[PDB]
Ligand binder design. Structure first.
Ligand SMILES: CCCCCCCCCCCCCCCCCC(=O)OC[C@H](COP(=O)([O-])OCC(O)COP(=O)([O-])OC[C@@H](COC(=O)CCCCCCCCCCCCCCCCC)OC(=O)CCCCCCCCCCCCCCCCC)OC(=O)CCCCCCCCCCCCCCCCC
Ligand SMILES: CCCCCCCCCCCCCCCCCC(=O)OC[C@H](COP(=O)([O-])OCC[N+](C)(C)C)OC(=O)CCCCCCCCCCCCCCCCC
Ligand SMILES: CCCCCCCCCCCCCCCCCC(=O)OC[C@H](COP(=O)(O)OCCN)OC(=O)CCCCCCCCCCCCCCCCC
Ligand SMILES: CCCCCCCCCCCCO[C@@H]1O[C@H](CO)[C@@H](O[C@H]2O[C@H](CO)[C@@H](O)[C@H](O)[C@H]2O)[C@H](O)[C@H]1O
Ligand SMILES: CCCCCCCCCCCCO[C@@H]1O[C@H](CO)[C@@H](O[C@H]2O[C@H](CO)[C@@H](O)[C@H](O)[C@H]2O)[C@H](O)[C@H]1O
Ligand SMILES: CCCCCCCCCCCCO[C@@H]1O[C@H](CO)[C@@H](O[C@H]2O[C@H](CO)[C@@H](O)[C@H](O)[C@H]2O)[C@H](O)[C@H]1O
Ligand SMILES: CCCCCCCCCCCCO[C@@H]1O[C@H](CO)[C@@H](O[C@H]2O[C@H](CO)[C@@H](O)[C@H](O)[C@H]2O)[C@H](O)[C@H]1O
Ligand SMILES: CCCCCCCCCCCCO[C@@H]1O[C@H](CO)[C@@H](O[C@H]2O[C@H](CO)[C@@H](O)[C@H](O)[C@H]2O)[C@H](O)[C@H]1O
Ligand SMILES: CCCCCCCCCCCCO[C@@H]1O[C@H](CO)[C@@H](O[C@H]2O[C@H](CO)[C@@H](O)[C@H](O)[C@H]2O)[C@H](O)[C@H]1O
Ligand SMILES: CCCCCCCCCCCCO[C@@H]1O[C@H](CO)[C@@H](O[C@H]2O[C@H](CO)[C@@H](O)[C@H](O)[C@H]2O)[C@H](O)[C@H]1O
Lengths: 171, 459, 606, 172, 52, 19, 98
């Protein structure tokens, strides 16, 4: 269609077949037919017309690729020229990570609606994946403050790594 | 920034070389064209600010403030040209020159990349503002108001000057880009306690901080309408903008230095909202409303979180358009009854129906009705303050109750009830007055459709 | 999906078109009220199609069409939840609003601002539909405060009247206090669940939900006018009668209960919240029904009935029966809006007389209004198989078979008896006996606008409860086994209320004067809550505002300790420096002292 | 107090009757108890001792306060009534018509022709009204808020404009 | 150019002049044109500078 | 009214030997 | 006292010019002032400026970030990698103290 099914999965659709157990006519069936004739059909033709115009003028746009530069770990201290590139990279990855957590949150919300009253059991995978990604995001970026930077992120990581070393030292 | 500085300067020759009957037409038309081109500043990137040269840069914080500043100059001209009609021609041109020179210092202040250049322009706005208040105010008290305005600001600014020069001596630079990479933490000491205070007190006085706010009810009341419009909309935001920038170099000392000033603000807003309930002067009521709203901005800047910085930026823009509109609304009444007393003229919705609609819309934005950007900013600040400490929801909640009471009290007292019998010169609203009202409210309500451009750098 | 999603949006878009036309000068203001009424009738028709699809197969969906704003990891989209609660409330609200609007064409005919009145009524409705279909909390807040502001504007319709402005501001004040809890819930959900979306809130299912749910309860306490924040609803009677009918059946007062229903996945697991809401509902339903026993303003009697019915809904929430509470919202809308339109019919015919003591003898003079009033009264009291019976009866027998507070259950049962008493008061004093109104008779209920609007709600008050109950899917286990005395409790106490009410009413006709009892004054003066609170709290706050905040601090002590003290010292120092005799001898004598101390004390010469 | 003893008793009579009517409700019951209440007032109609008369009035007020209705009947347009000040929002002062645009005035040429005559009648009478008030007022200003009639032919009663031209009780 | 409307070119010309001076500033800040690690590349056969 | 300007009383504040 | 002008009377712009827009006493200047305010204020800045804002090219690259995140999620889930790691920087490039 338009989006990738892998990034935004949707289980296969299973609609039951009509099994009328009444002699009465179904009002929804005739309303659906009227909707197709009076709404879907004229709307579809107007779109097919517009698509005929867009095919006569076909042009492209691209997704910007960003080459990787050295991280703030490789920057000599107070070396602004290398700090600037690492800092800009870190900010780009920060925004992307925000959108990753949004994708995982959108999967979780779609599952909860889709599964209805069975969501508590049928959305356990999406809950787990959301829990893991939120934990990773919290470790990277939480508590940095409004004036966050790659330097502050590194200091937060080093503090976390030091505690992990000490806890293992206990073992 | 020369594409805005130069044309802003060219407004001065334009005004002085205009025909005597076209000074308002020409200046208003061309200040609107400058306002139009300011939208080119919204070429903002996710990672990098827009850095034009060694002198000036623009980011998502300064860009909306710049756009608000250049939009206000046309509106200040329309608001002024009625009560200056009898004024001598050359004195009219000088009045416009002060407004233009104020805009020039503001657009450079919000874009100066070096903090000492920011300081000089930050201070240069005092001169035109002081002249506007004292020369063209109406009352005897305008002279005292100018003195309070001048010395409250300078008492805080002079320590800031010493602190900035000290920071340049020790760090080697005051360029803001450099300060982002060369910043070092501030370790506890009595020496650093006073560096922190000298870096923050000048900006707190401008906000104003509760306790240091006495200059504002005097200055915002004695000024001519244009002076009040710029004082409330923009000049108060020099304090907020300055704090947002300098707090970068004050960490982690802001952790405990913020406590006395968060307390003054959290309690200050409840005190200054309550004051508005018993205010007898309509302009004074509006002025005390600004103190209550800017208390949230102070708290949001001090707690220093991504949500509070977005909320602070939204509040500063939203308050600028709302508070300016309210002063203009109250001025229209004053230009009819020549008094600032709120209870003097009542039941005005009966005599001025359309202008009563503007009163309602201005009041609703003031009490932060969702989804106005006033609510967006005020809500984001409350969200982040709750995380800072859950009990702050009690003070934020109470302030929201009191703010609705005085916002609708002002609407009810002036617009509803019975008209005062002996006041018989309430002429119908002029086109100029209706247009001036709609040029505040319409942009304010449009921004709800696209609020991301007024949420600042942390969006 | 294409028809369901498409039709459920035209309903909302259809209602905004009169607003767009009015605001964009493209209308024929000839009969704008008829235009607005017609649009509502067409919205009702288009809203039935999605509802029928839900009835058929339980089809529900969420529409997140417009991405508005992303705050880091909080994406905010304009979303609409078209679920069980949305698909049944919307057609009911539109159907009731269709009658109120047709009724208001007759009732507000003489108003010079009738066009603006119909615009405000339409905005009132649009903000309620935003509230009821909101999928995230921010969108809900937009409608939550939207109905609050439209309520302010309509209650204070007659803005020359000081009492209308006091009542309007009172509604804002009490609802803003409630809104503190709404803001609290939003902040907790954002902080602890990283979401304002209803789906993520339920998926994560917080276990320690005391704080968010207390905030939600506080918000519902204000909007639904429960005890503590209750006085504003009776005061809202200052508005034109069409406002009261719409503000009490749909829109405002039901939003509080609806908010707790929307969050039943959380409340159904938090016992401590259930106890609080149960007791909050029980005191409200008992206290307000007690107040209605002695009111003489017909609108206030009906207003206190709404407060007592909303209290009953909160009890239903308190016993973990959100779906029964929702059913009561839907059934209540019919006969309560009808009752208000019946009182408006009487008030209009007696030249804006509202005191029941000046009515009487209208049973035969206003036959159709009489019929609707009796049908509305019987439905309110749970008469078997009328619309009210299909919610109220199930609620009472679900409350005496639950594991529940015994005082709350007993208080709820007494309130049911009181419901039959004040209902009998309106019929006895308005319809029966001899006329007590002025001598120039002008009764006339023969306008087709009046008849048709009430007739549709009369058909609703008879069959709507039966239709809805037989079409909604089951979502619980209805508890149908119980002792006979628990099954028929509601029916019996209602009958006892009618009998006791009739004896009390008939004793007003005896020639005996009796001094008022203490309980009579307590009921008449609303437990003195408005008399005390609305004088004490404003006085303390307003006096502090002036005496302390403004005078002591701002105009004195903040001046004294800084600008006034600093400037006084400079003046004193100046006079010391400059008050000199201009005498050569004294100046040069001071030179010698300076040179001496410069050497003796400071060693400037070393 | 500026009310005579007579005015206080008569006022108390009416007030007590209205509150009695609020308790009784039914007209026949009210008539029965209104006559008993009248008999009580008639019982001391001829009391000559002012001291005893005043004490009777004092007790009657104390009894009225004890027995008053907590929610008495109020006429809808009376102060406190449900229609009080309901139409104040529709009362627009006549001077607002001076600001009407000429295209608005051209819609009612006959109405504004008469209006001009009234304004002419107001100007030409003002001086006599001021003079009449000056010459009938004792030195040190008036002692009462009462006003005189016109004393001549063609004189208008001083200070009449805002009485005569006040908004209608049901303007819209 | 008329005697009555020549003043209306002052602000438009100031904008054009300011725009021009801003571009000349960009010509003194070319030390890292096509030299940053993120954007350094080759020049297209016909190109002269990556940005002017 | 109109803008206030110093009157004689105000001006004599600055006419004495000392302030 | 002194020799001073009395306060001048109030001037209602509508008496001389019923069609006054409230800008200038001169009716021709008054019309021009209204025209520039409305055309440059409403027609230009508000209408075109709102259109400009709506079609800003990916303000602050929020749309690129969503496209980039989708690319990363697709690549990481296909290859079995974690969606997001707790460490922002590779710990091989870090030298812990002590
Ligand atoms: C891109 C470029 C686009 C430019 C901007 C486009 C918008 C501006 C359109 C300009 C032309 C509009 C026009 O011709 O006015 C005609 C319009 C109709 O003429 P009228 O009947 O003679 O009005 C005279 C009275 O003053 C009328 O007074 P009124 O009281 O009868 O109605 C005025 C109305 C003010 O306007 C409104 O608010 C209408 C309702 C909202 C739509 O006041 C209210 O209704 C207050 C309550 C507002 C609802 C708030 C409740 C919460 C809802 C939040 C939901 C938000 C969801 C999104 O006049 C106006 O109402 C003037 C208002 C102009 C400001 C618009 C504010 C929109 C909000
Ligand atoms: C009908 C239902 C009832 C809903 C209420 C009616 C409102 C909805 C109607 C509009 C729908 C169309 C829409 O929203 O799209 C608009 C869109 C928002 O939706 P969008 O983001 O999807 O944009 C659509 C276009 N694409 C798809 C390419 C993104 O754009 C805007 O919102 C315009 C922003 C206007 C703000 C600019 C203000 C002017 C600035 C002038 C400068 C001076 C001002 C002062 C300075 C202040 C400081 C900054
Ligand atoms: C919690 C939320 C709070 C919200 C507060 C603010 C409320 C303001 C009122 C909202 C008004 C309704 C908004 C929904 C209508 C559509 C709005 C819109 O501008 O659609 C443009 C749409 C945006 O695309 P999207 O990816 O969803 O988001 C982009 C980020 N701005 O791009 C598209 O999808 C293209 C649509 C093209 C449709 C063509 C049909 C035109 C037919 C003629 C119409 C006349
Ligand atoms: C509106 C006004 C707001 C006012 C806010 C007041 C904040 C007060 C901050 C106090 C903390 C100052 O920071 C503190 O300074 C002293 C300097 O003597 C440092 O301590 C240093 O001097 C003290 C002597 O007193 C020694 O105990 C210590 O051995 C030495 O290192 C502390 O290591 C540091 O913690
Ligand atoms: C005008 C309103 C006045 C209201 C009264 C406000 C009183 C405000 C007092 C200012 C704060 C003083 O208290 C301040 O607390 C913080 C901890 O939070 C301390 O902070 C410091 O000490 C802590 C431990 O004590 C260490 O982690 C670290 O060295 C540093 O954070 C400061 O050394 C101390 O000075
Ligand atoms: C984004 C919006 C998408 C949909 C846009 C569709 C626009 C079509 C607008 C058509 C006219 C709307 O505006 C208005 O409509 C109604 C109904 O026709 C007309 O109103 C007419 O019918 C109604 C009831 O039938 C009468 O009460 C009224 O007396 C009469 O004038 C108005 O004269 C017209 O001005
Ligand atoms: C769920 C809905 C249930 C609805 C129940 C409706 C009411 C049920 C019957 C209530 C009691 C019926 O009323 C019973 O009989 C007659 C009326 O016919 C009353 O008789 C009365 O008649 C006259 C009225 O003209 C009174 O002035 C008199 O004081 C009294 O004798 C009795 O005082 C009462 O005991
Ligand atoms: C809080 C941080 C910064 C604070 C810095 C404050 C410095 C002072 C600024 C204002 C200086 C004004 O200096 C002077 O003040 C006094 C009152 O204060 C004014 O004087 C006025 O008040 C005084 C006393 O209240 C009266 O005696 C006098 O009749 C009246 O004119 C003078 O007109 C003004 O010239
Ligand atoms: C934190 C640093 C703050 C630095 C602030 C800058 C200080 C500026 C000092 C200005 C000093 C002059 O301010 C002076 O104050 C006194 C206040 O008593 C004023 O004096 C006024 O009040 C006094 C008594 O209250 C009266 O006797 C006098 O008649 C009246 O004019 C003077 O008119 C004013 O000239
Ligand atoms: C890209 C930049 C665009 C900038 C646009 C700025 C627009 C400003 C619009 C102002 C238009 C005023 O243009 C106006 O034209 C007429 C003739 O042409 C001039 O001359 C006129 O003045 C008087 C007014 O008293 C008229 O009665 C008379 O008809 C004529 O003599 C005006 O003196 C001039 O003011």
């Amino acid at each position: 269609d338009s989006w990738d099914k892998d990034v935004y999965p949707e289980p296969p659709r299973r609609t039951p077949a009509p099994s009328p157990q009444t002699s009465l006519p179904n009002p929804i069936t005739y309303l659906t037919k009227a909707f197709d004739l009076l709404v879907d059909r004229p709307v579809t033709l107007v779109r097919e017309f517009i698509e005929r115009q867009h095919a006569k003028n076909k042009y492209y746009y691209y997704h910007r690729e960003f080459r990787r530069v050295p991280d703030i770990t490789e920057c000599q201290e107070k070396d602004v020229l290398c700090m600037f590139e690492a800092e800009m990279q870190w900010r780009r990855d920060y925004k992307v990570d925000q959108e990753i957590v949004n994708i995982i949150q959108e999967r979780l919300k779609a599952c909860q609606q889709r599964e209805g009253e069975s969501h508590r059991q049928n959305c356990a995978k999406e809950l787990e994946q959301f829990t893991q990604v939120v934990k990773a995001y919290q470790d990277r970026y939480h508590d940095l403050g409004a004036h966050y930077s790659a330097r502050k992120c590194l200091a937060k990581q080093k503090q976390r790594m030091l505690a992990e070393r000490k806890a293992a030292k206990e073992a | 920034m020369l594409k805005y500085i130069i044309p802003t300067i060219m407004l001065m020759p334009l005004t002085w070389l205009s025909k005597n009957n076209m000074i308002w037409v020409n200046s208003t038309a061309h200040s609107l064209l400058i306002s139009f081109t300011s939208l080119l500043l919204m070429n903002q990137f996710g990672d990098n600010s827009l850095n034009f040269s060694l002198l000036f840069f623009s980011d998502s914080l300064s860009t909306p403030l710049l756009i608000l500043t250049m939009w206000l100059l046309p509106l200040m001209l329309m608001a002024s040209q009625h009560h200056l009609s009898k004024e001598n021609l050359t004195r009219k041109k000088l009045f416009i020159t002060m407004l233009i020179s104020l805009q020039l210092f503001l657009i450079m202040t919000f874009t100066a990349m070096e903090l000492i250049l920011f300081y000089i322009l930050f201070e240069a706005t005092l001169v035109p503002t002081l002249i506007i208040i004292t020369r063209w105010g109406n009352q005897t008290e305008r002279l005292n108001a100018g003195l309070y305005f001048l010395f409250y600001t300078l008492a805080g600014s002079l320590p800031l000057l010493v602190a900035l020069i000290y920071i340049q001596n020790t760090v080697g630079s005051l360029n803001f880009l450099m300060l982002q990479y060369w910043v070092q933490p501030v370790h506890n000491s009595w020496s650093n306690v006073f560096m922190w205070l000298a870096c923050m007190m000048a900006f707190m006085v401008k906000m104003p901080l509760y306790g240091l706010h006495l200059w504002l009810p005097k200055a915002h009341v004695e000024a001519p309408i244009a002076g009040s419009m710029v004082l409330a909309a923009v000049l108060l935001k020099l304090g907020g903008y300055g704090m947002l920038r300098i707090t970068l170099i004050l960490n982690p000392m802001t952790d405990f230095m913020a406590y006395p000033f968060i307390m003054l603000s959290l309690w200050g807003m409840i005190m200054t909202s309550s004051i508005c309930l018993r205010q007898t002067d309509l302009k004074s009521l509006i002025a005390y409303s600004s103190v209550s709203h800017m208390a949230l901005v102070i708290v949001a800047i001090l707690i220093q979180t991504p949500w509070s910085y977005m909320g602070a930026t939204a509040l500063m823009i939203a308050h600028g358009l709302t508070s300016s509109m309210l002063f203009c609304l109250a001025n229209s009444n004053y230009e009819r009854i020549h008094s600032r007393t709120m209870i003097l003229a009542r039941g005005l919705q009966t005599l001025l129906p359309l202008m009563a609609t503007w009163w309602l819309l201005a009041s609703l934005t003031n009490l932060a009705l969702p989804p106005t950007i006033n609510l967006i900013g005020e809500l984001f600040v409350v969200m982040s303050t709750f995380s800072w400490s859950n009990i702050t929801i009690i003070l934020m909640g109470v302030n929201m109750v009191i703010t609705a009471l005085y916002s609708l009290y002002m609407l009810i007292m002036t617009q509803r009830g019975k008209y005062t019998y002996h006041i018989n010169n309430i002429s119908p609203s002029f086109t100029r007055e209706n247009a001036l009202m709609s040029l505040h409210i319409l942009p304010l309500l449009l921004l709800t459709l696209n609020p991301k451009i007024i949420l600042g750098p942390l969006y | 999906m294409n028809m369901f999603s498409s039709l459920s949006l035209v309903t909302l878009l259809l209602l905004t078109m009169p607003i767009m036309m009015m605001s964009f000068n493209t209308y024929k203001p000839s009969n704008y009220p008829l235009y607005v009424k017609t649009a509502i009738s067409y919205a009702f028709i288009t809203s039935m199609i999605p509802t029928m699809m839900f009835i058929h197969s339980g089809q529900e969906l969420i529409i997140s069409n417009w991405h508005w704003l992303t705050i880091q990891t909080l994406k905010l989209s304009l979303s609409f939840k078209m679920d069980y609660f949305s698909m049944m409330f919307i057609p009911v609200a539109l159907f009731v609003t269709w009658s109120i609007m047709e009724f208001s064409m007759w009732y507000m005919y003489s108003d010079p601002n009738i066009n603006k009145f119909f615009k405000y009524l339409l905005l009132f409705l649009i903000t309620m539909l935003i509230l009821v279909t909101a999928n995230n909390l921010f969108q809900l807040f937009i409608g939550w405060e939207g109905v609050g502001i439209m309520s302010f504007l309509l209650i204070g319709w007659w803005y020359g009247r000081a009492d209308a402005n006091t009542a309007a501001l009172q509604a804002i004040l009490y609802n803003r206090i409630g809104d503190i809890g709404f803001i609290l819930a939003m902040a907790w959900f954002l902080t602890n669940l990283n979401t304002w979306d209803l789906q993520q809130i339920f998926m994560l299912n917080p276990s320690d939900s005391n704080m968010p749910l207390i905030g939600l309860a506080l918000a519902a306490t204000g909007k639904s006018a429960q005890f503590g924040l209750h006085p504003w609803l009776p005061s809202a009677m200052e508005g034109p009668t069409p406002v009261s009918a719409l503000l009490h059946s749909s829109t405002m007062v039901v939003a509080g209960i609806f908010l707790l229903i929307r969050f039943y996945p959380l409340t159904e697991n938090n016992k401590y919240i259930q106890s609080i809401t149960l007791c909050l509902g029980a005191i409200t339903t008992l206290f307000t029904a007690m107040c209605a026993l002695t009111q003489n303003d017909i609108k206030k009697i009906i207003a206190f009935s709404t407060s007592s019915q909303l209290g009953l809904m909160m009890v239903t929430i308190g016993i973990n029966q959100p779906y029964l509470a929702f059913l009561h919202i839907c059934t209540h809308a019919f006969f309560k809006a009808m009752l208000f339109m019946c009182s408006g019919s009487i008030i209009h015919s007696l030249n804006d007389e509202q005191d029941i003591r000046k009515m009487g003898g209208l049973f035969k003079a206003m036959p159709f209004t009489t019929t609707a009033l009796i049908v509305g009264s019987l439905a309110l009291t749970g008469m078997p198989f009328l619309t009210g019976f299909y919610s109220k009866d199930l609620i009472i027998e679900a409350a005496n078979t639950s594991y529940t507070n015994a005082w709350a259950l007993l208080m709820t049962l007494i309130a049911t008896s009181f419901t039959a008493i004040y209902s009998t008061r309106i019929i006895f004093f308005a319809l029966l006996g001899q006329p007590r109104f002025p001598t120039l008779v002008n009764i006339n209920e023969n306008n087709p606008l009046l008849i048709n609007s009430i007739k549709r709600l009369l058909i609703g008050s008879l069959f709507a409860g039966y239709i809805i109950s037989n079409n909604i899917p089951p979502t619980t286990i209805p508890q149908m086994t119980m002792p006979y005395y628990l099954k028929t409790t509601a029916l019996i106490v209602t009958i006892l209320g009618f009998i006791l009410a009739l004896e009390i009413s008939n004793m007003t006709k005896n020639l005996k004067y009796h001094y008022p009892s203490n309980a009579f004054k307590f009921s008449t003066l609303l437990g003195y809550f408005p008399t005390i609170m609305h004088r004490l709290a404003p006085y303390m706050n307003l006096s502090m505002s002036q005496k302390s905040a403004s005078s002591l601090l701002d105009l004195i002590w903040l001046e004294a300790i800084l600008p006034k003290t600093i400037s006084l010292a400079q003046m004193k120092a100046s006079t010391l420096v400059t008050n000199q005799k201009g005498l050569i001898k004294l100046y040069f004598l001071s030179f010698l002292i300076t040179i001496l101390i410069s050497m003796i004390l400071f060693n400037f010469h070393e | 107090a500026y009310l005579t003893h007579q005015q206080k008793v008569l006022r108390l009579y009416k007030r007590a009757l209205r509150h009695l009517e609020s308790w009784c409700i039914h007209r026949d019951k009210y008539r029965y108890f209104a006559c008993l209440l009248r008999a009580r007032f008639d019982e001391h109609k001829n009391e000559k001792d002012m001291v005893k008369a005043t004490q009777l009035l004092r007790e009657a007020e104390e009894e009225f306060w004890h027995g008053q209705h907590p929610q008495p009947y109020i006429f809808p347009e009376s102060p406190g009534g449900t229609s009080y000040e309901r139409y104040e929002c529709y009362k627009v002062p006549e001077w607002c018509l001076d600001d009407w645009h000429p295209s608005e005035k051209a819609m009612y040429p006959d109405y504004f022709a008469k209006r001009e005559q009234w304004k002419k009648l107001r100007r030409e009478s003002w001086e006599r009204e001021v003079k009449q008030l000056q010459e009938e007022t004792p030195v040190g200003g008036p002692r009462t808020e009462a006003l005189p009639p016109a004393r001549k032919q063609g004189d208008l009663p001083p200070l009449w404009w805002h009485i005569v031209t006040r908004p209608r009780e049901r303007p819209m | 150019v008329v005697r009555d409307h020549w003043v209306h070119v002052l602000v438009p010309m100031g904008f054009v002049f300011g725009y021009y001076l801003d571009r000349k500033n960009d010509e003194k800040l070319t030390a890292f044109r096509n030299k940053s690690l993120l954007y350094k590349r080759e020049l297209k056969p016909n190109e002269e500078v990556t940005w002017k | 009214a109109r803008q206030w300007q110093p009157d004689v009383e105000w001006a004599e504040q600055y006419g004495g030997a000392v302030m | 006292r002194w020799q001073e002008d009395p306060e001048p009377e109030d001037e209602n712009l509508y008496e001389k010019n019923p069609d006054s827009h409230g800008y200038d006493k001169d009716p021709a200047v008054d019309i021009w002032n209204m025209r520039v305010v409305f055309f440059f204020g409403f027609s230009i800045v508000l209408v075109l400026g709102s259109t400009f804002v709506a079609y800003l090219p990916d303000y602050r690259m929020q749309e690129w970030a969503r496209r980039e995140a989708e690319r990363l999620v697709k690549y990481r889930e296909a290859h079995g990698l974690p969606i997001m790691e707790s460490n922002c920087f590779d710990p091989s490039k870090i030298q812990l103290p002590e």
